[PDB]
Design a protein around this ligand. Structure first.
Ligand SMILES: Cn1ncc(C(=O)N2CCC2)c1C(=O)Nc1cccc(C(=O)Nc2ccccc2)c1
Ligand SMILES: [Mg+2]
Ligand SMILES: [Zn+2]
Length: 313
């Protein structure tokens, strides 16, 4: 009850900023998360013993892949942490409980392959879940872990509050399917320009939570250049692996994924900041003004990639 987690001074201060890196010490990530839930939710919203056991089962069920790993899980939870803390009064008691858990669980049991590779492989998951393949699995693994003995962190909720929070979590994890991002942003753009956005409409909150989930998931592009640059190496390590596996199926992979087309990466990143990242943090800034530092940091990194192309690094 009276047991507050407390971080060293540099982390106590830098954890509140959007551009925070959780660092290379694996064994501090669980305490960082618990720290964030306590300040974001209350010391009271989870039984410590149950929370910890949930966190360590979640960790166990992420794999040793270059990017879609336990560090990605916690990095994405931190970004959500910063959005919630800078937007104190806009979010319900259940959203704050649901959304940090959603971020932690959002890529559970990822094997480092796109939904496309699963479909072309004819993986059993492609048959069970025809759209948003990995995302329906991720949710499936979240519900499995919650139903382990001593892992039910929502035990003090009523039957109907329990169903609301698992519904927040499901929509949140499904929204991390980038295929769904484009249409979701397009519609939020229109709702904001034609003045029809209304956060009391449940279907409007869903869209807005979806965009936060995209923004948190892409947050490697909102870091200082050295974090952005070195994270990109992990991202492309997965992408080239999937490229190799496409080639094993007798399929020339898209250039993004071909390790022979390493030269075209800087141009590929320009496309990605222009087509996806900048549009994403722009619209998010319009809906939630205090998330502007994500847009700013994203723009800075676009300009670092333009400098890569101009041979200036
Ligand atoms: C940096 N970062 N962080 C996350 C991801 C990411 O996609 N994922 C993490 C699992 C999926 C990336 C990332 O570099 N992607 C990337 C790289 C190269 C090209 C494109 C692209 O699609 N361009 C493009 C799209 C539409 C139209 C025109 C051009 C995208
Ligand atoms: Mg994912
Ligand atoms: Zn992710």
């Amino acid at each position: 009850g009276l047991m507050q987690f407390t971080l060293p001074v540099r982390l106590c201060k830098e954890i509140e900023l959007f551009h925070f890196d959780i660092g290379p010490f694996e064994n501090m990530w669980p305490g960082i998360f618990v720290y964030m839930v306590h300040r974001s939710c209350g010391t009271s919203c989870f039984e410590l013993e149950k929370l910890c056991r949930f966190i360590m089962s979640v960790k166990k069920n992420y794999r040793r892949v270059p990017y879609h790993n336990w560090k990605h899980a916690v990095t994405v939870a931190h970004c959500m942490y910063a959005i919630l803390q800078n937007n104190h009064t806009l979010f319900t008691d259940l959203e704050r409980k649901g959304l940090l858990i959603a971020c932690l669980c959002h890529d559970l049991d990822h094997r480092g392959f796109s939904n496309s590779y699963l479909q072309k492989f004819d993986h059993p998951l492609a048959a069970l879940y025809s759209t948003s393949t990995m995302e329906q699995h991720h949710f499936s693994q979240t519900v499995s872990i919650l139903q382990l003995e001593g892992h039910n962190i929502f035990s003090t909720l009523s039957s109907s509050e329990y169903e609301q929070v698992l519904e927040i979590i499901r929509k949140a994890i499904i929204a991390t399917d980038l295929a769904l991002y484009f249409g979701n942003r397009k519609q939020l753009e229109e709702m904001y320009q034609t003045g029809s956005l209304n956060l009391n409409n449940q279907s409007h909150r869903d869209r807005v939570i979806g965009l936060m989930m995209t923004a948190c998931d892409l947050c490697s592009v909102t870091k200082l250049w050295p974090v952005t640059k070195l994270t990109a190496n992990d991202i492309y390590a997965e992408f080239w692996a999937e490229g190799d596996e496409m080639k094993k199926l007798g399929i020339q992979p898209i250039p993004m994924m071909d390790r022979d087309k390493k030269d075209e990466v800087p141009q590929g990143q320009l496309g990605f900041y222009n087509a996806v990242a900048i549009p994403c943090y722009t619209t998010l800034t319009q809906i939630l003004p205090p998330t502007e530092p994500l847009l700013k940091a994203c723009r800075d990194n676009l300009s670092q990639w333009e400098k890569v192309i101009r041979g200036e690094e």
